[PDB]
Structure formats: C-alpha cells, structure tokens
Design a binder for this molecule. Sequence first.
Ligand SMILES: *Cc1cc2c(cc1C)nc1c(=O)[nH]c(=O)nc-1n2C[C@H](O)[C@H](O)[C@H](O)COP(=O)(O)OP(=O)(O)OC[C@H]1O[C@@H](n2cnc3c(N)ncnc32)[C@H](O)[C@@H]1O
Ligand SMILES: *[C@@H]1O[C@H](CO)[C@@H](O[C@@H]2O[C@H](CO)[C@@H](O)[C@H](O)[C@H]2NC(C)=O)[C@H](O)[C@H]1NC(C)=O
Ligand SMILES: *[C@@H]1O[C@H](CO)[C@@H](O[C@@H]2O[C@H](CO)[C@@H](O)[C@H](O)[C@H]2NC(C)=O)[C@H](O)[C@H]1NC(C)=O
Ligand SMILES: COc1cccc(Nc2ncnc3[nH]cnc23)c1
Ligand SMILES: *[C@@H]1O[C@H](CO)[C@@H](O)[C@H](O)[C@H]1NC(C)=O
Ligand SMILES: *[C@@H]1O[C@H](CO)[C@@H](O)[C@H](O)[C@H]1NC(C)=O
Ligand SMILES: *[C@@H]1O[C@H](CO)[C@@H](O)[C@H](O)[C@H]1NC(C)=O
Length: 498
Amino acid sequence: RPWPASLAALALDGKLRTDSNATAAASTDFGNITSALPAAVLYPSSTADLVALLSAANSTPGWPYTIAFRGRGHSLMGQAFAPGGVVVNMASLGDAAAPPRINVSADGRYVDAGGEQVWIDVLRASLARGVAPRSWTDYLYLTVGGTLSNAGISGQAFRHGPQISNVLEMDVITGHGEMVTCSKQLNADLFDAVLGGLGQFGVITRARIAVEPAPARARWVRLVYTDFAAFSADQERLTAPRASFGPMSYVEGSVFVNQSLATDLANTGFFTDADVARIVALAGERNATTVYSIEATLNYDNATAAAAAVDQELASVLGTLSYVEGFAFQRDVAYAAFLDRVHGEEVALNKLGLWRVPHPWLNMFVPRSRIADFDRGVFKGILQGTDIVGPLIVYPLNKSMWDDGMSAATPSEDVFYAVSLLFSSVAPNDLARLQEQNRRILRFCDLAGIQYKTYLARHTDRSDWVRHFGAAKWNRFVEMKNKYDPKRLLSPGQDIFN
Ligand SMILES: *Cc1cc2c(cc1C)nc1c(=O)[nH]c(=O)nc-1n2C[C@H](O)[C@H](O)[C@H](O)COP(=O)(O)OP(=O)(O)OC[C@H]1O[C@@H](n2cnc3c(N)ncnc32)[C@H](O)[C@@H]1O
Ligand SMILES: *[C@@H]1O[C@H](CO)[C@@H](O[C@@H]2O[C@H](CO)[C@@H](O)[C@H](O)[C@H]2NC(C)=O)[C@H](O)[C@H]1NC(C)=O
Ligand SMILES: *[C@@H]1O[C@H](CO)[C@@H](O[C@@H]2O[C@H](CO)[C@@H](O)[C@H](O)[C@H]2NC(C)=O)[C@H](O)[C@H]1NC(C)=O
Ligand SMILES: COc1cccc(Nc2ncnc3[nH]cnc23)c1
Ligand SMILES: *[C@@H]1O[C@H](CO)[C@@H](O)[C@H](O)[C@H]1NC(C)=O
Ligand SMILES: *[C@@H]1O[C@H](CO)[C@@H](O)[C@H](O)[C@H]1NC(C)=O
Ligand SMILES: *[C@@H]1O[C@H](CO)[C@@H](O)[C@H](O)[C@H]1NC(C)=O
C-alpha cells in the first residue's frame, strides 16, 4: 500500500482527486447508456504526471487500479471509463499557455498536436498557417488521441484513408511508464498497435498529422435517387481509383425512409422547402419506400478562375452519373464552415434537449458484394414502419487506403461501406426498442452470411473480439498487449482484456 514519491506528489498538488464531483464527471459518456465511477481522476499538467502514474502502476506489486484516458468522452458504451480505477482527464494537458499544444511544422507539411487536443482546435491552428489535415471525422469536437485509437472516418477516407493512415509519428507512454516516440521507421510495432488500438497499449501524448494546403471553399452537392442500385453504382464510380482518383474531395451518402421523408429532408439543413416538396413528389411517383442521397464536395481555393473551373468540373462529373434528372442540389460555403457543419447540429439538438440523450448508434463496415442485400434487409426491411431520429449514413471505402498491419479491423473486400445508423433515443420505451433493433440488424447480417466488422462498438465476449480482428490478427493484438500493457490496466472499458 505504500506510494512512490512522484505519485504522492500528485495528490499533494491537488492533481489526484477523489471527490464526488471529479469522479461523477468521469463516470458518464456520450452514449448515455452505461456508467461507471472511478476511484480517482487525475488532472495532469504535464506528460511527467502521466509517467508518474504509469511508472507507479508498473512498479507497485498488486496495483489494483485500471487506467483510462478520457478525451472528450464521446464513447458510446463506456470505453473511456475506469470502474474503481483512475480516469485521466486528458484535457488538463492543454490548461496553460506555455508551451503551445499544437505546432504546425516550419515546412508546412505536418501539424504536431497533443493527444488531448480536439480536432476543431487542430483545424483552427492549421488554417492560421494556411494548411489543414486531409482526413477528417464528421464531427470536430473529438480528441486527436481518441479518433486515432479507433480510426477516424469521413467523406475523404476513400481517397486519403482514415485518420490512422495520415499519421507520421507519435509520442506514446506505455503501460510500463516509458515515454516512446514511434513511427514506421522507429518502434513501428508500437506505432501500428496504437493506431486503431482502442487505448490498450498506452497513451498518445503527441501525434504528427499530415496536412495539405488549405482550400478556401467547398462546392457542396446532394444528388437524389429512388433506385439503390443506381445510388451505390454512382458512389462507387465517384470513389473508384482511375493511386489516382476522380475530382470529388468528399463522398458520403444518406438513406431516407419514406415514413418521415419530408421531416428528415427538412432536418438535413441542406434542402429548402421547395427542394423537399420536389423529392417527396418524386418518391410518390416512383412508389419508393426509401430515397437515397449522395453528398459530395469539390474543394477549391480563392483563385479568380476557381468558381468557373469548378462549375465545369462539376458539370462533367455529374454527366457521368445516373441520379434522377434534375435532382442535383448545390451549395457553396467556406471550407471551415463545411468541416464544422455538425457543430451547428449539436447546438440545435442540445437546445431542444435532444443531444444529451441515449445514443444506441449502430456503426459497421459492410462488404460491397452484400450492400444491396443490406439495403433490402435493413433500409427496405427492418427499418420500415419505425420513426427514425438521427441520420442514416452510407458510403463506400477503398481498402487499399487502409493499413491492415494496424490494429483497426476491416472487411476483406477491396470496397466496403461505412454504414452509420445514428439512432437517438426519445427516452423510454424508445431506448430498449432501439437496442433490440440493433441486435436484429446484426442477427439479419449473421444469418445472411454478411462478413461485416463493427466500428466504435465494444464486444463483451472474447469470441466476438477474436472474430472482430480475425484469429491471426487477434494473436498479433495480444502479443502487443503483452509487451506494452502486461498488467492489463489500460482502457478496461473496451472489455477486451478486462
Ligand atoms: C460523439 C461523436 C463521436 C463521433 C462522431 C460524432 C459524434 C457526435 N463522428 C465520427 C466520425 O465522423 N468518424 C469517426 O470515425 N468517429 C466519429 N465519432 C466517434 C469517435 O471517434 C469516438 O467517440 C472516439 O472515442 C473519440 O472520442 P474521444 O476523443 O472523446 O475519446 P474517448 O471517448 O474519451 O475515448 C475513446 C477511447 O480511446 C482511449 N483514448 C482516449 N484518448 C487517448 C489517448 N490520448 N491515447 C491513447 N488512448 C486514448 C480511451 O481510453 C478510450 O478507450
Ligand atoms: C510545441 O512547440 C513548443 C516550442 O515552441 C514545444 O515546447 C518545448 O518542448 C518541451 C515541452 O515539454 C520542452 O522540452 C521545451 O522546454 C519546450 N519549449 C518551450 C519553453 O516552450 C512543445 O512541446 C510543442 N508541443 C507539441 C505537442 O508539439
Ligand atoms: C410514404 O409515407 C406516407 C406517410 O407519410 C404514405 O402516405 C400515406 O398513405 C396512407 C395510406 O393510403 C394514407 O392514409 C395517408 O394519408 C398518407 N399519409 C400522408 C400524410 O401522406 C405513403 O403511402 C408512403 N409510401 C409508400 C410507398 O410506402
Ligand atoms: C463513423 O461514421 C460516423 C460515426 C459517428 C458519427 C458520424 N457522423 C455524425 N455524427 C453525428 N451527427 C452527424 N451529422 C452528420 N454526420 C454526423 C459518422
Ligand atoms: C444520461 O443522461 C441523463 C440526463 O442528462 C442523466 O441523468 C443520466 O445519469 C445519464 N445516464 C447515464 C447512464 O450516463
Ligand atoms: C479567401 O479569400 C477571401 C477574400 O480575400 C477571404 O475572405 C477568405 O478569408 C479567404 N479564405 C481562406 C482564409 O481560406
Ligand atoms: C407500391 O409499393 C408498395 C410497397 O413496395 C407495394 O406493395 C405496391 O404494390 C406498390 N404499388 C404499385 C402499384 O406498384
């Protein structure tokens, strides 16, 4: 039970807190479905405090405290908790002013960012130097270390890969309490393990993130379909390799069920009421139970000719497509306004009291060969007759842009779809129904032989995690767990080794 000097110094300096206010704040997450109180919350003022805690953990025999690294707690099912353990309040690393926690490189080819930093601040500090990361998440108020522990995907991933494919190097403190810098060339085994590694191997204190010259504006389009075959064929055309890709900077898509079509179209924040009326009419003419929309952008800069060159490039692209004649809808915004588009959605929902609610989200990767089966079984099947609150996002990814040596698990096929069904619960009895429906969707997929992977989900059975990674890739994961977290204390809320 004796404490090392450096661990005791943290309690003395008021950094180790055991009060009910501190512990309660670190006991809930964005999922708002599960909770777990820690014994203590650490508020580090430097990476030395992290070394202190993890060295103590490693050297103290019989050490009982699991350790989690809370980013912004956007986890869905407790992945950032440490039940009866220590939660690290990562945000405390950026409390001061000296030194800065985000540094754009002198050559403008990368940005250095603290693990604790949120992507919105990474964006703001990048644009101040005329650059920006190439690969995003839909939502910018997430931490660098958090998204990198998962993958980080948005409409750019088809061409640039996920955020984990856009890291040059990291500083990481392992379960041993050892500060290690890692890359493809230095300590590559740790580098690959941590990326998509679900916080199992250590804490990312710094990430070196690839940037590109920052575009000024995004030409922003949505294309409407009643035929899934045409919708998916076009998403695949837009994202297909020609190493080289087509013009589009971003390609996502969405599914709208007929029952709430007008309301959901109106709630996109994209369509006007005039647009909505035309799409509702189209659905009725085609007798459609589902409507599909491709969402795409073309990034361009402040050049004088840029706007007309964009018009012509866009016109050419669209002429290769098969959306319903006349159902192309365009917007034109500043690039930062596009990237932070979901912030506005959060503000609106929270003011309605619809943000801090349970989020039984279903996120998965579905092989291209079975996407039409998934559409029939889920969008045209299971989901029909239900009231859906939250977007249903569907878009293809290219496996060639994913590094399978990293921890992140993906389907085997060259093309696979991100399917994100972002259900928001309107309290009882809606939550239990939504949890059951997600089970049924997974059940449908299992029975149809669809070889999907989950994303952002934590499994509670060993056989499920083994299947998740694949047996050979699982053994790799375990090898790296043994070297970097032998005491199995880190990120216990993933329920892999805890
Ligand atoms: C809330 C949410 C999440 C989200 C999103 C939109 C919203 C509203 N949009 C996403 C998107 O478009 N694309 C995508 O890939 N993910 C998207 N997300 C999910 C998001 O990536 C996850 O929630 C992720 O966990 C990031 O969230 P956060 O930064 O808040 O991290 P956390 O929940 O607290 O912890 C997650 C796990 O990672 C470990 N962790 C956290 N920080 C570190 C560091 N620095 N080093 C090592 N491990 C770390 C935690 O222990 C936990 O297990
Ligand atoms: C951002 O750059 C600053 C330098 O402008 C870095 O600060 C130095 O690095 C470490 C901080 O732990 C110390 O060894 C030096 O004394 C710091 N210099 C001073 C006094 O500012 C900082 O580490 C960088 N941040 C990241 C995460 O890249
Ligand atoms: C799409 O959804 C609407 C419901 O919003 C359906 O229209 C309804 O049809 C029923 C049965 O004839 C009528 O009783 C309702 O008055 C209609 N509702 C409204 C408000 O328009 C429509 O049938 C659905 N289409 C498909 C193909 O399922
Ligand atoms: C990995 O795919 C995901 C996972 C979680 C969230 C999202 N995106 C969004 N999450 C929340 N609100 C939104 N509005 C538009 N897109 C989103 C996308
Ligand atoms: C969910 O949020 C509500 C309201 O903000 C809160 O009272 C409750 O404790 C939360 N539940 C969990 C399990 O986090
Ligand atoms: C592009 O230039 C315009 C006009 O000079 C300016 O308003 C805008 O801030 C610039 N966009 C950036 C910083 O990318
Ligand atoms: C309209 O679609 C519904 C549901 O798919 C179907 O039952 C019905 O037969 C269709 N109507 C016609 C005339 O095709």
